[PDB]
Structures are given as C-alpha cells and as structure tokens.
C-alpha cells in the first residue's frame, strides 16, 4: 500500500533528505482521503496517528483553559499529529478539514522510523514548539501612563501581521535598528519571524492584536552562554518604558535558556538604548565608526524592576515555550 518516495519528497520536513532515506517510511504509511468538513483529530484524544498533507487544507483549533480557541491552519507539505507523538501526550488541538484533503498517514511505528531519518526529528521538534507557542497565554502588561498591552512570543504570522498592520515604524526607527531606513526585505522578515526559541528567542508586545514592539536574543555560535540582544519599539509607543520592560522580560527568558551574558551593539548616538544598558552597566567599547558595543551579565534575581508576580508570569510563559517539547 506504501507511498511513492516522490509522494513524500515535497513535504517540508523531508527537504534536503536523500531519496533512499525515505524508503522505509514510504513503506510504513497509507493514503488518506477526507472530505471538506471532516474531523481528523481531537484535543483530548491519545495519539496513535500522524498525517502528511498532499492536498487541501485543515483548520487547527485549540481550546485554552480560558476557554477561548486559538485557530491556525495546516497546509500541504506539513505534518500534523506529530506533536502529541513527540511529547507522548494528548492531541494539542482539534484538526478539521477545510478543503477536501490527501492523504499520507502513519502510526506510532511509521513515526519511529520517521524520527530516525537524520535531521528529521530535529525539524519536527523545532516546528513543534514553534506551533505550541500559539497556545501560550499572552501576559497583560500595564505601563506607567496607563496604556495597556500584551506580552507573548513571536509567531511566524507576526511577519504578516506587521507588514500589513496599521502600526508605523519610521525610517529613522528602521535605521536605528537595522542601520537602514528602508523597510526590511522579505528574507529578513522571515528571519526575524521563524525561530526555534532555543538559540533564538523573541518577545513581542501588542496592543492586543497587532505587535507594537519586540525584543530578541540570538545565542552566540561559538559561546552558547552569551547571546546578542536587540529591540524594536514602534514610534508612538517609544519612550513609555517598553524597552526597559522588554530587557527585563528578555532577561527572564535568557535565564531559562541557559544564557548568561548579553552582548549589545548600537549607534553611538542612540541614547535611550545606551541608557537602558547603563542601568545594568556596563563599559562601552568602540566596535566601529559611530558604532559601539558592550557585554553584561544577565540580571538575574533581585536586579529587576519588573515585580514578582510579573517575573513569575513571564518566566512561566517563557519556560512554557522553551521546554514545551523537551
Ligand atoms: C541592542 C539594540 O537593540 S540597538 C537598537 C535598538 N532599537 C532601536 O533603536 C529602534 C528604534 N528605537 C527604539 O526602539 C527605542 O525607542 C528603544 C527601544 C531603544 C528605547 O526604549 P523605549 O521603549 O522607546 O523607551 P524606554 O522608556 O524604555 O527608555 C529607556 C531609558 O531611556 C530614557 N529615554 C527615553 N526617551 C529618551 C530620549 N528621547 N532621550 C534620552 N533618553 C530617553 C528613559 O527615560 C529610560 O531611562 P530611565 O529608565 O533610566 O529613566
Ligand atoms: N499553530 C499550529 N500550526 C500548525 N499545526 C498545528 C498548530 N498547532 C497544532 N498543530 C497540529 O495540530 C495537531 C493536533 O494534535 P497533536 O498535538 O498530535 O499535533 C498537533 C500539530 O501537528
């Protein structure tokens, strides 16, 4: 009954893989056909199953404890059902066919053989937590002047959210951040967007719909105990204390991630960033003309202006995203 290796060769998780690598698995799966409106999976059910989508589309619906449902979509080239099999846990979501759908599917054993394809298990994990991040609970954040926002992790869709959003990021902003006043290339947006949360962590703050700002760190290639950090705040939200908060938040996430030292780079002439830094120290060095750097140990307990309940919620959400699949 098995699948033609070509049949699986389009699936995102298999890209780069040598055809021979896929044969055992291609032998371990059966074809699946489903009509529009049909239910493939359900949120509490134990996981016996996984599916790879050749054609059609499916709605993903997750009911949080609040009782409100986050929705996403599963599309051709994508696995679904992998996560519960990854964590050995219940279905994270209910999955329903939108478009009539095909149709490669397998069981626990096929999954095993799949995981044993080199660098496949890793992709699966990455993408898994990537998806689980949508189900985490956005933390209410009320700044000193009363304006109310939300703290959550970046989602790939933030990319879209931001490009077509009504929130303005000035050329001067773009320049202070990326050193060009121009709007970020699609390639770049993808980079800022899709992350593993392990070597690349990103906070976004929103008005409750659209992201108004972000803070991220990327673990150093050679030294995993240090990461370079960066921030962006939308023009009209600047100067209200968002950046200070975000370095706190980022610091909690960092602590979780096993990161110790933050590295920073910036225009010598960008005062607020420098000020934020200066609160923790530390000495500035000149990296290049008009450009400065620095290195700080990560505060750390007692060194944060955030709160207790607050650092609790943050550390909780962060750790929830980071260790979700491991
Ligand atoms: C490592 C990197 O990310 S470098 C580049 C950073 N990103 C950018 O430059 C992009 C566009 N500009 C921004 O995003 C900036 O507004 C940020 C994020 C650097 C600043 O953070 P914000 O959220 O805007 O304001 P925030 O309230 O956190 O400012 C922090 C500190 O600088 C002070 N500050 C605010 N505005 C100004 C200003 N116009 N001039 C001087 N100091 C200022 C604040 O008082 C505060 O100091 P304090 O807490 O000791 O009193
Ligand atoms: N945000 C998302 N985007 C795409 N697919 C998802 C998302 N969240 C959950 N899923 C899939 O929905 C499945 C529901 O049950 P599982 O946890 O077995 O595995 C889950 C994932 O394969």
Swiss-Prot record:
Residues annotated for Mg(2+) binding in this entry: 207
Record-listed E.C. numbers: 2.3.1.-
Effect on the protein upon substituting residue 178 to A: Completely abolishes the interaction with the aliphatic tail of the substrate lysine
Any Pfam family the entry gives: Acetyltransf_3
Keyword annotations from UniProtKB, A to Z: Acyltransferase, Magnesium, Metal-binding, Transferase
Protein role: Catalyzes specifically the acetylation of the epsilon-amino group of a highly conserved lysine residue in acetyl-CoA synthetase (ACS). This acetylation results in the inactivation of ACS activity and could be important for mycobacteria to adjust to environmental changes.
Binding, substrate: 166, 231-233, 239-244, 270, 279
TM segment ranges: none
Provenance organism: Mycobacterium tuberculosis (strain ATCC 25618 / H37Rv)
Annotated 3',5'-cyclic AMP binding sites: 81-84, 91-92, 131
Description of how activity is regulated: Autoinhibited and allosterically activated by 3,5-cyclic adenosine monophosphate (cAMP). An extensive conformational rearrangement relieves this autoinhibition by means of a substrate-mimicking lid that covers the protein-substrate binding surface.
Known outcome of mutating residue 218 to A: Substantially decreases the interaction with the aliphatic tail of the substrate lysine
Subunit details: Homodimer.
Cellular component, GO annotation: cytosol
Gene3D superfamilies per UniProt: 3.40.630.30, Jelly Rolls
Listed name of the protein: Acetyltransferase Pat
Cofactor(s) in the UniProt record: Mg(2+)
SMART domains: cNMP
Domain N-acetyltransferase as annotated: residue spans: 149-311
InterPro entries reported in the protein's UniProt record: Acyl_CoA_acyltransferase, cNMP-bd_CS, cNMP-bd_dom, cNMP-bd_dom_sf, Env_Response_Regulators, GNAT_dom, RmlC-like_jellyroll
Gene Ontology molecular-function annotations: acetyltransferase activity; acyltransferase activity; cAMP binding; DNA-binding transcription factor activity; metal ion binding
